[PDB]
Design a binder for this molecule. Structure first.
Ligand SMILES: O=C(O)CNC(=O)c1nc2cc(Cl)c(Cl)cc2[nH]1
Ligand SMILES: O=C(O)CNC(=O)c1nc2cc(Cl)c(Cl)cc2[nH]1
Ligand SMILES: [Fe+2]
Length: 190
């Protein structure tokens, strides 16, 4: 229930850590339906080059396109969490969000050099990779939260939702992927 997830977990977590992970966000059935939609997009060659900086291929999805209705459901689900966060007494307001950025790292040692997404703004990432073994497949998101002496390594696990502040508080990189690695990102801003 968004009301509870936002107010009891996401807000305090974002306040304390600036990074929040929610596993099993939508469940396996819905998650694999999104997986199947992303693969269909990928199989038709609709992804364009995300660019020495990044090896990903991407497409932007509004959520109402034929074949994209479950991706639209994911977006509505993220929207509701953000709405409950920004509706808290004393909170700043979000005025917009991007379309869904569907991204594929097509193995072959592709990754993303360390960067800052927006050098407020929140990055929301939903991962789609079932039984991902990072030891063999790579693709770890390494994040450097401000204030911590350690970095955090986040596996791009199926049905995992990740929030983090998009600004210089959270530089991050995608370590090289050696298997096809899928994710969907939405940025919430202003
Ligand atoms: O809870 C407090 O004492 C301050 N924090 C906030 O107002 C707050 N507003 C927020 C809005 C968004 Cl969209 C997100 Cl992800 C976290 C937030 N945290
Ligand atoms: O896939 C992950 O686990 C992380 N991905 C990224 O950091 C990432 N950051 C990005 C920033 C921009 Cl501006 C664009 Cl277009 C794609 C990105 N992809
Ligand atoms: Fe990024």
């Amino acid at each position: 229930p968004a009301l509870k997830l936002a107010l009891e977990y996401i807000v305090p977590c974002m306040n304390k850590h600036g990074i929040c992970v929610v596993d099993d966000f939508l469940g396996k059935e819905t998650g694999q339906q999104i997986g199947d939609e992303v693969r269909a997009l990928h199989d038709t060659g609709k992804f364009t080059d995300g660019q020495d900086i990044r090896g990903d291929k991407i497409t932007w999805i509004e959520g109402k396109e034929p074949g994209c209705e479950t991706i639209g459901l994911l977006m509505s689900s993220m929207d509701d969490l953000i709405r409950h966060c920004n509706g808290k007494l004393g909170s700043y307001k979000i005025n917009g969000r991007t379309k869904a950025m569907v991204a594929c790292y097509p193995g072959n040692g592709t990754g993303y050099v360390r960067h800052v997404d927006n050098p407020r703004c929140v990055t929301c990432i939903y991962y789609l990779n079932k039984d991902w073994d990072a030891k063999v497949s790579g693709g770890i998101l390494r994040i450097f939260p401000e204030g911590k002496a350690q970095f955090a390594d986040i596996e791009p696990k199926f049905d995992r939702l990740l929030f983090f502040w998009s600004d210089r508080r959270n530089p991050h990189e995608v370590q090289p992927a050696y298997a096809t690695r899928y994710a969907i990102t939405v940025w919430y801003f202003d």
